[PDB]
Design a protein around this nucleic acid. Sequence first.
DNA 1: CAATATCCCGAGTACATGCACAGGATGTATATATCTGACACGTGCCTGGAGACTAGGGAGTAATCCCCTTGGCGGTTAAAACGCGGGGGACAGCGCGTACGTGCGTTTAAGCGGTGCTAGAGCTGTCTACGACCAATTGAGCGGCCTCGGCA
Length: 45
Amino acid sequence: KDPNFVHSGHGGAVAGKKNRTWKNLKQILASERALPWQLNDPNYF
DNA sequence: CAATATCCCGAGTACATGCACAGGATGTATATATCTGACACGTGCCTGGAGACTAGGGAGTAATCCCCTTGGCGGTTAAAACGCGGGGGACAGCGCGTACGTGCGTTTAAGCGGTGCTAGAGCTGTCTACGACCAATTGAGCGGCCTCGGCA
């Protein structure tokens, strides 16, 4: 009936005290600024 | 002496208190723990002692009238007591906050290595501030010149 029930653990706060569902957008972006971008590349920031 | 008042004693009066009860949360109890700091050891400083001397101050006195102190002052209200007004006092209910419980997830503490901020260094090296002295100013009091009011 329903599409699925054995849903995967994508990243929620089961394993520790950290923020509940997932990182906020600012924290995501702080991890995107680490990548090997080059001077012509489109981006979100 | 009369009068308003405080004091005192017994009847009658709700509930307050001290108690008994169920039960729950925490104080105990044991074992373990490192580490606070106790204790022991010297380090080196100032707290103290101890002298010589001036000059600042302190103590003393003398003279005295300022200020306090007192009496007697004249003037007006806080108190006394009453009349007199409204206002502090005793019940019915709403629902809003406070509490309290749930699951909310933010941040701190800790232990990590790196490093630059600060706080003890100088004779730093001077020179603001510290006396030292001079000079200006105002004010006050004392002489001295000059119109006029009461007296011969």
